[PDB]
Design a protein around this ligand. Structure first.
Ligand SMILES: *[C@@H]1O[C@H](CO)[C@@H](O)[C@H](O)[C@H]1NC(C)=O
Ligand SMILES: N=C(N)N1CCCCC1
Ligand code: NA
Ligand code: NA
Lengths: 11, 28, 251
């Protein structure tokens, strides 16, 4: 249900 | 911090939020 | 939050969302206490009865938010965790005594109109304001009812309750490291924290210096917004020596 966050914060 | 607890959009501008007065009225 | 309302923009700029990386989901609330430190409940991070034991790399903190589910481009800031510190005497076995934890961010967060720290109480502000009947404010993105979920941050103001009434409401052993808040059945008004609000702040605005102080952390309850039940909160001032020790040693 959450909008994807920028991939930079998951690296 | 020195500036803690003072909100940019409220205390720093001398604007009150819609329900903070309810808190003040309870401090009797 | 049950029986609250939508927050105003910038109303709670110390609000933090604890966000699980995978699956991407809300884990808890939290609060910003400096540019590098976030305060939350220990049970948000460590609760063995539910096989919960998060490590730093499992989580993110999202600061400056208003919408629950949106990525708030140009407004929110997302930070990684350097280290979690849980109170060494946090009692997850029995009653959540000393339900407090700190998270140090990898880099300082930039303050803005939407991002700003709350104060921690001194002894005198705590003694003056932690009185039955005095109201504080609880905020979060948790559920709207015990048995659904908000579009934006919710807020509710609730009175501190007399300690014997807190004790008499539950079979759980209450300690000096806890206080309870909420309306009594005869008071008509309602409201409580609920699932997903854990770890977020209970704040009071000092009438002496017109600053907001975090007096409590959403800790536990039995259901949400039940008549004759109250929400329980970690007593921040009582645990402040530990907070200061961690920040002094590791900050
Ligand atoms: C939680 O996780 C760490 C390891 O990441 C572990 O060493 C620690 O003992 C665990 N705590 C409990 C109560 O299981
Ligand atoms: N305040 C209540 N009711 N709580 C604490 C937040 C999770 C649900 C129980
Ligand atoms: Na009891
Ligand atoms: Na209740």
């Amino acid at each position: 249900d959450f909008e994807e966050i920028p991939e930079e914060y998951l690296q | 911090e020195a500036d803690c607890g003072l909100r940019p959009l409220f205390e720093k501008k001398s604007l009150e939020d819609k329900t903070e007065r309810e808190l003040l009225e309870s401090y009797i | 939050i049950v029986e609250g309302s939508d927050a105003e923009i910038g109303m709670s700029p110390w609000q933090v969302m604890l966000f699980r990386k995978s699956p991407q989901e809300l884990l808890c609330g939290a609060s910003l206490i400096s540019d590098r430190w976030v305060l939350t409940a220990a049970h948000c991070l460590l609760y063995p009865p539910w096989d919960k034991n998060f490590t730093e790399n499992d989580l993110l903190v999202r600061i400056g938010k208003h919408s629950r589910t949106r990525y708030e481009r140009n407004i929110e800031k997302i930070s990684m965790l350097e280290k979690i510190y849980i109170h060494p005497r946090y009692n997850w076995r029995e009653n959540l005594d000393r339900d407090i934890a700190l998270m140090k961010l990898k880099k300082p967060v930039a303050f803005s109109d939407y991002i700003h720290p709350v104060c921690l109480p001194d002894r005198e502000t705590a003694a003056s304001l932690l009185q039955a009947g005095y109201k504080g404010r609880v905020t979060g993105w948790g559920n709207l009812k015990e048995t659904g979920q908000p579009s934006v941050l919710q807020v509710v103001n609730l009175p501190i309750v007399e300690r014997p009434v807190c004790k008499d409401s539950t079979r759980i052993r209450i300690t000096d490291n806890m206080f309870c808040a909420g309306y009594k059945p005869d008071e008509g008004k309602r409201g409580d924290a609920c699932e997903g609000d854990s770890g977020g702040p209970f704040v009071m605005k000092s009438p002496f210096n017109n600053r907001w102080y975090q007096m409590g952390i959403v800790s536990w309850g039995e259901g949400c917004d039940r008549d004759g039940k109250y929400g329980f909160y970690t007593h921040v001032f009582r645990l402040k020596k530990w907070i200061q020790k961690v920040i002094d040693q590791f900050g």
